[PDB]
Amino acid sequence: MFKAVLFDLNGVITDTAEYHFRAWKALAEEIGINGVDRQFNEQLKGVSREDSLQKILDLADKKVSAEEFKELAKRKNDNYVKMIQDVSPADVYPGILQLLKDLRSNKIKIALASASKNGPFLLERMNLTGYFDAIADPAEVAASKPAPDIFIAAAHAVGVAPSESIGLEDSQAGIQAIKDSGALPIGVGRPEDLGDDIVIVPDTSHYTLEFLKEVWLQK
Numbered sequence: 001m002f003k004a005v006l007f008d009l010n011g012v013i014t015d016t017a018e019y020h021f022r023a024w025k026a027l028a029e030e031i032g033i034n035g036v037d038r039q040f041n042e043q044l045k046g047v048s049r050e051d052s053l054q055k056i057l058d059l060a061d062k063k064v065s066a067e068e069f070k071e072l073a074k075r076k077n078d079n080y081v082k083m084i085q086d087v088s089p090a091d092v093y094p095g096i097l098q099l100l101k102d103l104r105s106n107k108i109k110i111a112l113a114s115a116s117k118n119g120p121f122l123l124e125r126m127n128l129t130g131y132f133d134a135i136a137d138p139a140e141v142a143a144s145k146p147a148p149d150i151f152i153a154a155a156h157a158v159g160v161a162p163s164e165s166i167g168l169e170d171s172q173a174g175i176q177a178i179k180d181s182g183a184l185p186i187g188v189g190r191p192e193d194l195g196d197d198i199v200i201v202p203d204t205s206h207y208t209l210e211f212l213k214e215v216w217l218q219k
């Protein structure tokens with residue numbers, strides 16, 4: 001049986017992938033880059049703040065100064081942080097709170113494997129901090145998603161091997177990070193975005209402990 005579940009945050013625990021998208025698109029258009037649409041944004045999900053900005057600049061073959069790069073990432077983050085101040089427990093995605101309760105009942109460790117430095121603030125907004133056995137600090141890994149380091153760190157943090165873990169993700173970068181960590185991925189979203197080669201569910205109501213067991217047994 002699996003011994004840990006490693007959670008992405010944005011687009012898995014709550015609908016904050018939408019707010020990252022809207023904030024990055026606003027940032028891009030301010031600097032004359034109009035190509036950040038929903039299709040392009042599939043390449044930004046799971047990617048660090050600085051890597052996201054660089055992918056947007058690269059889309060436009062645009063070069064900025066080191067000073068302007070730092071200011072742009074800070075500008076987007078300040079906008080995003082204002083957007084999330086009113087997040088509340090009512091914004092937890094369907095199934096997620098019950099899953100956390102069921103995992104703890106069954107002595108399955110719970111770790112956050114988020115790239116977001118805003119992760120702890122968001123778990124507090126949603127009254128979820130108490131469910132987590134560990135939060136892997138994304139500033140501490142030497143390599144961000146799609147590198148597996150954050151999932152390895154989340155597992156290490158709860159004393160479980162990646163190979164004994166399930167990872168939950170809504171992104172391309174994060175699915176690759178889980179694969180390379182040794183854990184079993186279960187994606188949430190569209191197969192057209194996340195692929196046809198792992199288990200994908202259409203929405204988070206499907207993330208029940210019953211279903212994670214159903215998937216783990218059929219691995």
Ligand SMILES: O=P(O)(O)OC[C@H]1O[C@@H](O)[C@H](O)[C@@H](O)[C@@H]1O
Nearest residue numbers: 020045046047049115116117118
């Ligand atoms: O800018 P933050 O809050 O540190 O978030 C980093 C990344 O966190 C990931 O969880 C999101 O999918 C990305 O969209 C985001 O860029």
Ligand code: ALF
Nearest residue numbers: 009010046114115
């Ligand atoms: F959406 Al994340 F780490 F929370 F990639």
Ligand SMILES: [Mg+2]
Nearest residue numbers: 008010011170
């Ligand atoms: Mg995500």
Ligand code: NA
Nearest residue numbers: 124125126127
């Ligand atoms: Na709170």
